[PDB]
Symmetry: C3
Subunit: 301 residues, 3 copies
């Protein structure tokens, strides 16, 4: 069975200097089935991904059961599968100055995307959850000696709160050229009525020149070094009636290289029916940074 | 909600010299919704446009209400939104020698396409209609100082006839390189039973070397000059029973550069059910021009 | 009317040296309609082919009736339309070492693919079938003097068996550069309960350097020569309960150039519901050849 859903948005966006019209529409194909013993299986991808979904680069395929779910394709990484990301600000998701996303190292469309189809395993039992993920250590089916990437996370919900932790590791095929990167994450999610609060603290080590490239700095002509980093952040959103207001603030401090605090503030008004007016503002504290902002309508079909 | 429709055609086509098989199939995704106060909203794009529809280059998004409809994306331009184009000849739309389309300067996939998402506003009240359109004056969200393009049109239906007028203007970012282009259009549409008659007269001014490029002439190594042009044409089609016969003739006279009359004659036979046999013939009076022609079946699903 | 179906698979694949995750998902658009006298017409293409299906390179359009079916697009060639191919081994279709496909010269995505939309005509009456196919002798609608390719096949079912024959011919536009290629095929299909047996014998002549390129050999700096070849093979599959086991073996002997025998063995277990576990092994006898193999699940929606 194949079900269709879709979305669209339109409005105006300020990129720091000019306003521009911004719009889009997408269509999602969700396919499902149950085997005779009650195993579930399915697949989904958006229409603009038809081509990569046909090679396993985009879209995901899965099979679940009493043993947990195995998913393959552009599967999220284990930590991000359990904890997700922060309040999404702006109708276009105002990612320009850093975004609402938690800086997960692996999985998805993140640092490991070249590796795809990656595999995600997840399993819950009552109030606990575990997730583990990895590439094959080759570039999909072309047996390329590469990035072996992997992650593990686990959570525990106790009433109102989930708290969890995860570990992500990216192995370098030539550490004289690229240090291995690793990160440890702790996250705590709390819902109190119409308010959601999500907070995280991650720490680990990054390859020097990847870290210098994050902040847009030329690399240094030397062998690879690992620098230490710690990241952390918070979003709060609440809904009153049909109005949600929310924001987030996060910091990345990569030691010996630079520090940035980035943030955003947004609001939505639900017109009911699948449409809402959404608008937002995000920025960070580095040097250049010019706020971006937007305002428009978002539609779910 | 997401509805699917689609089309397909197949037959043989004569390009001036040889016959070739010609065929295609397309699928259109139409998505709709109503908000709690009865505002309508939607989005649509064809499957082969999944990629550009995801950036706002292809497909359109809209929101309508008592105030009129706002549409954003590859929106038609205001004049073309009210008056449309002439009898479509041939199963492949025999556009080779000039086509059935009225030479609108803006909107759509026309001279302004780079500008997209462009915006179209339309509003009717009883028997009158207004439409206005424009780009943002940037290249979508990449704030590129460019083509500010805009148009306005209005119509009035009085029984059997609509008559209307429109104005289209394209501003040059460096008039020493490209003159501004403008056009004024008047159109009159009349339905008399099973006969439709559409006629227009447009006039204005074009950039010299754009006009020379239309007729496929090298440009002249000089600063930009505007040349004056006037365009006009007519189509008539009628249906008897299951057979429609129709044609059009149009002329473009760009002063000091060249004149062309182009035309076409076609017929359809409806097999009922969404299929019809369609065939046609088009040509113009320039020098080379070898008639193109075709014959095949067209299918709507 | 537009119906959606789709498929997906996931598992691990061994390419001769390494195992890799391999997965995909696809969506097929099938569109149909009946005219007032009961002619059927339709079109279909997969989502990842939206772009070529819009030019007639991918997907097919058709119109059938009492006269037979005419199909245009990426239509299969006449022989392959009647006889199909051998047991498909492996969840990814383990085509690496030669595959389960019978070496048809024309149609489809085979040697004639550049030619597409190609045309297929088929007609059955009781127990007999005929099929004929061809390109236009141009490169679709760009009138390119090329490959005129064509084929004819016919079959006869007598109870338990179909036996048939076909002829395929590819004409060279410069025989000093490329010999014409031709092939004659005989095939016999037999179903005995849950067992299917398919066998073929083809023979003809190939262009020398195409034949040398098949076996991956540099060509020889001389004018084109035709070499003679004969191909033949067999697959057997049977289902016991929910387990199907099957395999095939085929040989290509191109005279004065090289001989290869290629084969594969696979099995499926049906989980019911559209999912099955499939796995397989294929290889050939040339020199390098390292077996490929796979194991995973396949899903139909
Ligand atoms: C710890 C691994 C991080 C991996 C993902 C990168 C996280 C990026 O967000 C942090 C930085 O703030 C935004 C980027 O700063 C660069 C300049 O602004 C962009 C235009 O020049
Ligand atoms: C007034 C602005 C016009 C902007 C759109 C162009 C209108 C084109 O149709 C008129 C010309 O007739 C067809 C083209 O003539 C050129 C040569 O034929 C094509 C193959 O060489
Ligand atoms: C008679 C016309 C044949 C036209 C289609 C080609 C048939 C290919 O299958 C036969 C050969 O066996 C597989 C290929 O052998 C080449 C080397 O292996 C591949 C990796 O190097």
């Amino acid at each position: 069975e194949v079900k269709l859903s879709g979305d669209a948005r339109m409005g105006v966006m300020y990129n720091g200097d000019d306003w521009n019209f911004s719009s889009r529409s997408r269509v999602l194909f969700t396919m499902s089935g149950t085997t005779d013993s009650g195993l579930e299986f399915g697949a989904s991808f958006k229409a603009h991904e038809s081509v990569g979904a046909e090679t396993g680069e985009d879209g995901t395929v899965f099979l679940s059961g009493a043993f947990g779910k195995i998913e393959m394709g552009d599967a999220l990484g284990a930590s991000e599968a359990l904890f997700g990301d922060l309040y999404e600000v702006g109708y276009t998701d105002l990612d320009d100055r850093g975004g609402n996303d938690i800086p997960y190292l692996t999985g998805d469309e993140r640092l490991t995307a070249e590796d795809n189809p990656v595999l995600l395993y997840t399993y819950s039992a009552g109030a606990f959850s575990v997730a583990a993920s990895m590439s094959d250590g080759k570039v999909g089916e072309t047996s390329e000696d590469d990035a072996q990437e992997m992650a593990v996370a686990a959570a525990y919900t106790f009433g109102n709160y989930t708290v969890g932790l995860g570990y992500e590791k990216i192995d370098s095929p030539d550490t004289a050229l690229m240090a291995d990167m690793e990160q440890l994450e702790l996250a705590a999610i709390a819902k109190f009525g119409a308010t959601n609060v999500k907070a995280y603290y991650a720490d680990g080590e990054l390859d020097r020149d990847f870290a210098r490239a994050v902040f847009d700095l030329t690399p240094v002509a030397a062998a690879a070094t690992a620098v230490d980093h710690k990241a952390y952040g918070l979003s709060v959103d609440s809904t009153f009636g049909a109005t949600t207001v929310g924001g987030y603030v996060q910091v990345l401090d990569i030691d010996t290289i630079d520090d940035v605090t980035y943030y955003g503030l947004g609001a939505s008004y639900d017109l009911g029916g699948g449409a809402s007016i959404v608008g937002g503002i995000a920025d960070n504290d580095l040097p250049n940074s010019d706020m971006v902002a937007d305002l428009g309508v978002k539609f779910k079909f």
